[PDB]
Amino acid sequence: DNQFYSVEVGDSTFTVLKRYQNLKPIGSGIVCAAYDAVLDRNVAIKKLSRPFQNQTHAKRAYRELVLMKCVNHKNIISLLNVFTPQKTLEEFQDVYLVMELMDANLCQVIQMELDHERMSYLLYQMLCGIKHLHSAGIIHRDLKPSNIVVKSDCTLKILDFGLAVTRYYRAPEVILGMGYKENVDIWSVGCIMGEMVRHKILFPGRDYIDQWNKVIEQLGTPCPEFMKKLQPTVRNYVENRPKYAGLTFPKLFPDSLFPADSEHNKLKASQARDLLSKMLVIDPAKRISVDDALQHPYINVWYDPAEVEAPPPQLDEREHTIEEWKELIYKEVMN
Ligand SMILES: CO[C@H]1CC[C@H](C(=O)Nc2cc(-c3ccnc(Nc4ccc(F)cc4)c3)ccn2)CC1
């Protein structure tokens, strides 16, 4: 009459409530798909294994659990259930997060040919979500395809809340650590959009060094005044990098790559390029804001004041010993 049972999912041991049935490996913390017999709907279940095991695993977990439990928007994850099989703070090991299941992760979507209604819709949804987080002072700073999911009917959700390991989608200000505002997530959005057109990661980099080489090798060296905002040592590295005027957007995202047989298709293809050309701007002082990107004629066909302007959702990251976490996380799981 103990409510839990154990199975192997892919590899690891899942100990979940009896309600979740027919667990299937979909991800690897270690995520899987299940039928929730109570709700009668499909679900994704995520195993967090000893999440108090270090400051990295811990902060991420505590942040993402407080955060998950007060953000309420159709384009960010709606947590359906949190539970631990362990009975006592003494025996506590794992946390299981549960949300409803989508048909695709955004990496599979990037790999196909999107028409503009769809591509435009995803990017719209990404912005609505991003717009929600920003209104609770949450600046994500690490949007990536693997943490976005999608329904067959084209509805999109963002799974995570970002930086306090895929670095391709991180903004210039992140890569060189310089201080950001909300549109830092506009870089990342545009890197996703860019990849939807190109079906190639825009900036495939070994490290922050290799990545930066790849940004400028295409968009060009940032102008004088951007550099004048970098900390003396980083500014000095950046300044003695080989210069580049870099390709223009028609050259970066040619006509070859676009649906362009209908006149609609032709008209929209140039609207995407325009929008991309505004998102993928290195200097954040020159890069489009989340409110402008929604007034762009590519996106704005979807504009919905209910979606775009939703009511906004203690102060987080702080130092704790890997025992004080065990308890902090455990209290959050028991509510
Ligand atoms: C073979 O798999 C198919 C069927 C569906 C499949 C798919 O991945 N569907 C799908 C996957 C997730 C998912 C993926 C990776 N990580 C998390 N983390 C997570 C965070 C919080 C939380 F509460 C729960 C989990 C959730 C969510 C919804 N739907 C794509 C292809």
Side-chain angles (χ1 to χ4, degrees), residues 151-215:
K151 255 193 284 203
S152 289
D153 77 357
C154 209
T155 71
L156 174 142
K157 280 173 196 280
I158 301 166
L159 295 176
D160 84 311
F161 304 90
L163 269 34
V165 204
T166 320
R167 295 183 210 261
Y168 310 147
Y169 307 83
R170 304 178 178 190
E173 51 261 35
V174 181
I175 288 164
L176 315 155
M178 75 191 58
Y180 55 94
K181 24 150 165 178
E182 19 273 277
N183 77 343
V184 60
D185 293 5
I186 289 285
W187 179 269
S188 327
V189 169
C191 283
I192 298 177
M193 171 174 207
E195 199 190 324
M196 282 161 161
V197 172
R198 217 194 264 163
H199 311 287
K200 219 94 209 63
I201 294 145
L202 267 49
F203 321 107
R206 280 183 284 119
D207 50 320
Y208 277 164
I209 296 286
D210 183 29
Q211 245 214 286
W212 177 248
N213 286 342
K214 293 240 208 327
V215 165

Side-chain angles (χ1 to χ4, degrees), residues 20-40:
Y20 314 113
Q21 318 158 182
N22 196 215
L23 318 190
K24 279 185 186 179
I26 62 182
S28 202
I30 313 133
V31 174
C32 64
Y35 175 61
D36 179 350
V38 165
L39 263 35
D40 181 43

Side-chain angles (χ1 to χ4, degrees), residues 26 33 41-44 74-78 99-106 108 125 148-159:
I26 62 182
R41 71 212 297 276
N42 289 320
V43 304
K74 51 155 283 202
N75 296 116
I76 333 287
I77 156 202
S78 302
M99 63 169 293
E100 67 136 6
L101 191 88
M102 325 271 272
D103 304 295
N105 78 84
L106 205 258
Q108 300 151 257
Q125 287 189 95
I148 305 179
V149 277
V150 220
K151 255 193 284 203
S152 289
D153 77 357
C154 209
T155 71
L156 174 142
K157 280 173 196 280
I158 301 166
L159 295 176

Side-chain angles (χ1 to χ4, degrees), residues 220-279:
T221 310
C223 51
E225 62 272 353
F226 174 84
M227 253 87 146
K228 200 225 72 235
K229 311 164 187 195
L230 287 158
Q231 221 49 74
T233 41
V234 170
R235 192 229 266 244
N236 154 90
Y237 158 71
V238 170
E239 248 147 1
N240 338 307
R241 292 271 85 172
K243 294 86 183 183
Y244 286 97
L247 331 187
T248 57
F249 281 91
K251 293 299 223 164
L252 278 165
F253 296 91
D255 286 279
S256 338
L257 296 167
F258 279 108
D261 53 17
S262 167
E263 208 85 58
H264 188 270
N265 270 4
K266 291 185 171 100
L267 172 69
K268 293 270 150 186
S270 82
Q271 258 150 71
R273 212 196 278 100
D274 187 62
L275 179 51
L276 251 173
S277 87
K278 289 176 185 156
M279 287 182 166

